[PDB]
């Protein structure tokens with residue numbers, strides 16, 4: 001599923017991300033835009049053989065099992081395929097674990113390089129929230 005901006009904002013808000021670990025909703029929307037272009041089915045293969053999955057491009061080295069990332073962890077206790085669903089529950093719940101873990105939203109490269117320090121509230125401006 002390819003979300004619209006306000007549609008995704010609404011889904012993320014209802015699922016508890018607004019101000020989760022102090023990160024306002026616009027941060028999460030911005031991260032999703034630049035990680036996946038709001039596409040739940042996005043995948044990206046990395047150099048190290050891991051893969052990034054879903055609207056927040058969550059990585060198989062640490063967070064999910066894809067059967068093809070040897071020596072890895074599955075800290076969200078999910079198949080990586082759960083991160084591609086039209087239902088963003090698994091992605092949100094896993095994101096909550098990631099952002100609690102130490103470097104906060106810096107875990108998302110697109111967030112650090114394209115959202116951090118910017119007017120992220122623009123990403124939710126106009127939306128009925």
Ligand code: NA
Pocket residue numbers: 060061062063064065066069072073074
């Ligand atoms: Na894994």
